Amino acid sequence: ASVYAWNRKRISNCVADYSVLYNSASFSTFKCYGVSPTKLNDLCFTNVYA
Amino acid sequence: DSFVIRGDEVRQIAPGQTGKIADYNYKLPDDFTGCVIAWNSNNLDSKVG
Amino acid sequence: SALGKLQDVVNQNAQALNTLVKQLSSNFGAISSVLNDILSRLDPPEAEV
């Protein structure tokens, strides 16, 4: 989607294997604020928003 | 410590950085005391094909 | 009330303790008032700050 009409996808009731993202080489920018992605494998949340 | 990388990866040669290079190839300490120097070598390390 | 001069003392100290404990729940500019939560979210280079 265009930036002005940016899409939002809600993620809930699922297991998040963040490795697939932080082990991939397909990304040029991967910047996590207030968190480290590796630790996200040990963390739970009520919702995520992509 | 001398080596060669690609351009956009030069940013990874610094303390506290992450990525393929900083993780699996060459990792600097968070308390690094020293200099990092880098210059393009397309004329030397690149060839047709 | 006759024993106020004693009770007051106790109360004072109690406050000075409660306040102290309360000051653990603050952030002081940090992203969290807890320590393990920071250790479980950040790497040393920023958890240190």
mmCIF file of C-alpha atoms in Angstrom:
data_model
loop_
_atom_site.group_PDB
_atom_site.id
_atom_site.type_symbol
_atom_site.label_atom_id
_atom_site.label_comp_id
_atom_site.label_asym_id
_atom_site.label_seq_id
_atom_site.Cartn_x
_atom_site.Cartn_y
_atom_site.Cartn_z
ATOM 1 C CA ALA A 1 0.000 0.000 0.000
ATOM 2 C CA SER A 2 1.007 3.604 -0.539
ATOM 3 C CA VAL A 3 2.570 5.218 2.513
ATOM 4 C CA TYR A 4 -0.337 7.635 2.946
ATOM 5 C CA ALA A 5 -2.739 4.660 3.063
ATOM 6 C CA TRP A 6 -0.298 2.320 4.804
ATOM 7 C CA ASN A 7 -1.736 -1.120 5.496
ATOM 8 C CA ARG A 8 -1.994 -2.557 8.998
ATOM 9 C CA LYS A 9 -2.061 -6.276 9.794
ATOM 10 C CA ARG A 10 -2.965 -7.429 13.297
ATOM 11 C CA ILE A 11 -1.181 -10.519 14.627
ATOM 12 C CA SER A 12 -2.763 -12.464 17.482
ATOM 13 C CA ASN A 13 -3.166 -16.003 18.812
ATOM 14 C CA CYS A 14 -0.059 -17.364 17.122
ATOM 15 C CA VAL A 15 3.565 -18.302 17.736
ATOM 16 C CA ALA A 16 6.082 -15.851 16.277
ATOM 17 C CA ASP A 17 9.353 -17.394 15.076
ATOM 18 C CA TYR A 18 11.193 -14.106 14.677
ATOM 19 C CA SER A 19 14.325 -15.948 13.510
ATOM 20 C CA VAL A 20 12.901 -16.150 9.982
ATOM 21 C CA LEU A 21 13.247 -12.357 9.951
ATOM 22 C CA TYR A 22 16.476 -11.704 11.862
ATOM 23 C CA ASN A 23 18.233 -14.710 10.303
ATOM 24 C CA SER A 24 17.302 -13.674 6.752
ATOM 25 C CA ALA A 25 19.615 -11.644 4.521
ATOM 26 C CA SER A 26 16.840 -10.076 2.417
ATOM 27 C CA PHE A 27 16.624 -6.836 4.436
ATOM 28 C CA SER A 28 18.791 -3.726 4.241
ATOM 29 C CA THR A 29 17.408 -2.005 7.359
ATOM 30 C CA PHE A 30 16.540 -3.985 10.506
ATOM 31 C CA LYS A 31 16.334 -1.588 13.459
ATOM 32 C CA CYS A 32 14.584 -2.587 16.693
ATOM 33 C CA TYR A 33 13.967 0.135 19.284
ATOM 34 C CA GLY A 34 13.497 -0.627 22.966
ATOM 35 C CA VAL A 35 13.934 -4.322 22.214
ATOM 36 C CA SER A 36 16.296 -6.928 20.773
ATOM 37 C CA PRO A 37 14.758 -9.339 18.246
ATOM 38 C CA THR A 38 16.463 -12.427 19.676
ATOM 39 C CA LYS A 39 14.775 -11.791 23.020
ATOM 40 C CA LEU A 40 11.381 -11.673 21.284
ATOM 41 C CA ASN A 41 11.520 -15.473 21.139
ATOM 42 C CA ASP A 42 11.098 -15.432 24.944
ATOM 43 C CA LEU A 43 8.293 -12.851 25.098
ATOM 44 C CA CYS A 44 4.506 -12.769 24.868
ATOM 45 C CA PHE A 45 2.085 -10.021 23.861
ATOM 46 C CA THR A 46 -1.657 -9.568 23.521
ATOM 47 C CA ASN A 47 -1.299 -8.163 19.999
ATOM 48 C CA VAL A 48 1.239 -7.190 17.371
ATOM 49 C CA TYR A 49 0.780 -4.731 14.517
ATOM 50 C CA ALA A 50 2.629 -4.955 11.197
ATOM 51 C CA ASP B 1 42.853 -6.123 10.897
ATOM 52 C CA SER B 2 42.400 -5.975 7.126
ATOM 53 C CA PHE B 3 39.638 -7.351 4.914
ATOM 54 C CA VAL B 4 37.146 -6.423 2.181
ATOM 55 C CA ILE B 5 33.359 -6.038 2.266
ATOM 56 C CA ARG B 6 30.663 -4.409 0.168
ATOM 57 C CA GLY B 7 29.767 -0.751 0.569
ATOM 58 C CA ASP B 8 26.552 -0.818 2.586
ATOM 59 C CA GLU B 9 28.195 -3.191 5.077
ATOM 60 C CA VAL B 10 30.847 -0.662 6.142
ATOM 61 C CA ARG B 11 28.279 0.635 8.645
ATOM 62 C CA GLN B 12 28.468 -2.751 10.420
ATOM 63 C CA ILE B 13 32.201 -2.269 11.150
ATOM 64 C CA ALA B 14 31.641 -0.362 14.383
ATOM 65 C CA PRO B 15 30.810 -1.102 18.031
ATOM 66 C CA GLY B 16 27.304 -2.207 18.886
ATOM 67 C CA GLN B 17 26.317 -3.020 15.298
ATOM 68 C CA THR B 18 24.442 -6.081 14.059
ATOM 69 C CA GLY B 19 24.088 -7.978 10.801
ATOM 70 C CA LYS B 20 25.729 -10.716 8.789
ATOM 71 C CA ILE B 21 29.180 -9.132 9.027
ATOM 72 C CA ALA B 22 29.137 -8.024 12.663
ATOM 73 C CA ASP B 23 27.594 -11.341 13.736
ATOM 74 C CA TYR B 24 29.351 -14.034 11.680
ATOM 75 C CA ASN B 25 32.412 -12.396 10.076
ATOM 76 C CA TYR B 26 34.031 -9.630 12.157
ATOM 77 C CA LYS B 27 32.688 -8.315 15.460
ATOM 78 C CA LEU B 28 34.074 -5.231 17.250
ATOM 79 C CA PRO B 29 33.824 -4.825 21.034
ATOM 80 C CA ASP B 30 31.361 -2.392 22.549
ATOM 81 C CA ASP B 31 34.341 -0.646 24.196
ATOM 82 C CA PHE B 32 36.496 -0.514 21.058
ATOM 83 C CA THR B 33 39.380 1.961 21.283
ATOM 84 C CA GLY B 34 40.888 2.456 17.852
ATOM 85 C CA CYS B 35 40.335 3.504 14.275
ATOM 86 C CA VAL B 36 38.330 2.102 11.366
ATOM 87 C CA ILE B 37 39.378 3.046 7.830
ATOM 88 C CA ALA B 38 37.618 2.072 4.621
ATOM 89 C CA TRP B 39 37.946 3.058 0.975
ATOM 90 C CA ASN B 40 36.317 1.919 -2.251
ATOM 91 C CA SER B 41 38.319 -0.689 -4.172
ATOM 92 C CA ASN B 42 36.105 -1.234 -7.223
ATOM 93 C CA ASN B 43 39.086 -0.557 -9.489
ATOM 94 C CA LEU B 44 41.027 -3.389 -7.812
ATOM 95 C CA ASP B 45 38.584 -5.999 -6.474
ATOM 96 C CA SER B 46 35.978 -5.874 -9.274
ATOM 97 C CA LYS B 47 36.272 -7.229 -12.803
ATOM 98 C CA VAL B 48 34.016 -7.807 -15.787
ATOM 99 C CA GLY B 49 32.009 -10.958 -15.149
ATOM 100 C CA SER C 1 -2.211 12.008 71.141
ATOM 101 C CA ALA C 2 -0.111 12.485 74.288
ATOM 102 C CA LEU C 3 2.561 10.178 72.829
ATOM 103 C CA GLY C 4 2.713 12.057 69.531
ATOM 104 C CA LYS C 5 6.390 12.904 69.909
ATOM 105 C CA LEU C 6 7.071 9.174 69.699
ATOM 106 C CA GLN C 7 4.547 8.178 67.047
ATOM 107 C CA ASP C 8 5.605 11.040 64.780
ATOM 108 C CA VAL C 9 9.149 9.677 64.761
ATOM 109 C CA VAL C 10 7.977 6.243 63.645
ATOM 110 C CA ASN C 11 5.783 7.751 60.946
ATOM 111 C CA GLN C 12 8.650 9.861 59.625
ATOM 112 C CA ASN C 13 10.933 6.861 59.268
ATOM 113 C CA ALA C 14 8.121 4.850 57.700
ATOM 114 C CA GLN C 15 7.625 7.563 55.098
ATOM 115 C CA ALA C 16 11.353 7.736 54.433
ATOM 116 C CA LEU C 17 11.224 4.001 53.790
ATOM 117 C CA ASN C 18 8.024 3.897 51.750
ATOM 118 C CA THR C 19 9.187 6.771 49.565
ATOM 119 C CA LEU C 20 12.482 4.959 49.083
ATOM 120 C CA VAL C 21 10.727 1.781 47.995
ATOM 121 C CA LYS C 22 8.430 3.803 45.761
ATOM 122 C CA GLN C 23 11.469 5.276 44.036
ATOM 123 C CA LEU C 24 12.154 1.778 42.707
ATOM 124 C CA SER C 25 9.016 1.925 40.560
ATOM 125 C CA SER C 26 10.188 5.025 38.677
ATOM 126 C CA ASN C 27 12.016 5.233 35.349
ATOM 127 C CA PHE C 28 14.317 8.261 35.733
ATOM 128 C CA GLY C 29 14.301 8.700 31.960
ATOM 129 C CA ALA C 30 14.719 5.008 31.175
ATOM 130 C CA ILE C 31 12.346 2.871 29.126
ATOM 131 C CA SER C 32 11.305 0.839 32.175
ATOM 132 C CA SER C 33 11.406 0.894 35.962
ATOM 133 C CA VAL C 34 12.412 -2.790 36.050
ATOM 134 C CA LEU C 35 15.896 -4.188 35.501
ATOM 135 C CA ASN C 36 15.355 -7.751 34.283
ATOM 136 C CA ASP C 37 12.836 -6.474 31.740
ATOM 137 C CA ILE C 38 15.570 -4.272 30.279
ATOM 138 C CA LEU C 39 18.016 -7.176 30.405
ATOM 139 C CA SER C 40 15.401 -9.288 28.596
ATOM 140 C CA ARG C 41 14.815 -6.715 25.840
ATOM 141 C CA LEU C 42 18.151 -5.035 25.134
ATOM 142 C CA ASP C 43 21.745 -5.991 24.523
ATOM 143 C CA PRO C 44 24.513 -4.635 26.772
ATOM 144 C CA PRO C 45 25.348 -1.629 24.558
ATOM 145 C CA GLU C 46 22.016 0.026 25.431
ATOM 146 C CA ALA C 47 20.905 -1.772 28.574
ATOM 147 C CA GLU C 48 24.045 -0.188 30.009
ATOM 148 C CA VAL C 49 22.694 3.308 29.325
#
